[PDB]
């Protein structure tokens, strides 16, 4: 217990939350996957839809590498404020929030190779433009667009973790 506490203190001591992993170097690759809990509302009058998900992101930070502890430290969520995280945002979103009951629905897990896992339970009202010219004999294309706000491809790179199996839970959705 003392060893783990001192290791965590050492990792968080002398840490800057203001430089991406490998600041001067190749761009940091962030692997992301989603678990769709439900798709609740699909409003044609507003042309949008509500979607709840377990967003999860993975990156590799050598600054948070520890040795001698053979386990994956799942830290308290508040440590996310003390660590660098991507500035990912949903481009076609109209309103979204992170659930805060019983606490902030957030996840930080530091693997011993520097691999940081960051999780958030997010509800988003994403815009979905619709073509109701054949209504009710219509087939829509709704989309969710995920993008880095400040950084560019020379600094941050995105990829779907697990290929086509990144997004799960779509099969279990029962829309009315």
């Amino acid at each position: 217990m003392s060893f783990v506490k001192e290791t965590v203190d050492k990792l968080l001591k002398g840490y800057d939350i203001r430089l991406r992993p490998d600041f001067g170097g190749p761009p940091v690759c962030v692997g992301m996957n989603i678990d769709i809990a439900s798709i609740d509302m699909v409003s044609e009058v507003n042309m949008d839809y509500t979607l709840t998900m377990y967003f999860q992101q993975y990156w590799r930070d050598k600054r948070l590498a520890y040795s001698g502890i053979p386990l994956n430290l799942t830290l308290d969520n508040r440590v996310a404020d003390q660590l660098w995280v991507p500035d990912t945002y949903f481009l076609n979103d109209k309103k979204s929030f992170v659930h805060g009951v019983t606490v902030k629905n957030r996840m930080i897990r530091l693997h011993p190779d520097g691999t940081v896992l960051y999780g958030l339970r997010i509800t988003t009202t994403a815009a979905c433009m619709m073509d109701l010219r054949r209504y009710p004999l219509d087939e829509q294309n709704c989309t969710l667009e995920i993008e880095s706000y400040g950084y560019t491809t020379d600094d941050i790179e995105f990829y779907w973790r697990g290929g086509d199996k990144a997004v799960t839970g779509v099969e279990r959705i029962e829309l009315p």
Partner: nanobody
Amino acid sequence: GSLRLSCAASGHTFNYPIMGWFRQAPGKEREFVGAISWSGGSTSYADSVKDRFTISRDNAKNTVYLEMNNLKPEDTAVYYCAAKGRYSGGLYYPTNYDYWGQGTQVTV
């Protein structure tokens, strides 16, 4: 002197509403010429081809018409027609456009 190109589209046009025109002169890089939205009332032209071009759209027959005016010798080029999806990026760059046309040669 007076020309009227007509780029027609077939398929999932609603997925690719923002339809634009580029031109490539021989030995030159591709350049932006014009763009138009789904409703056909939001035209945007490059400064080098302003006040002598026009773009119109019709959806009953899915087509965009590029109406020309008094030309210049530099206007000779292969004119291409491309489509872009909502939430794709800027208009002036060709990499954001997915589906391109074959390209029609014009010489004046």
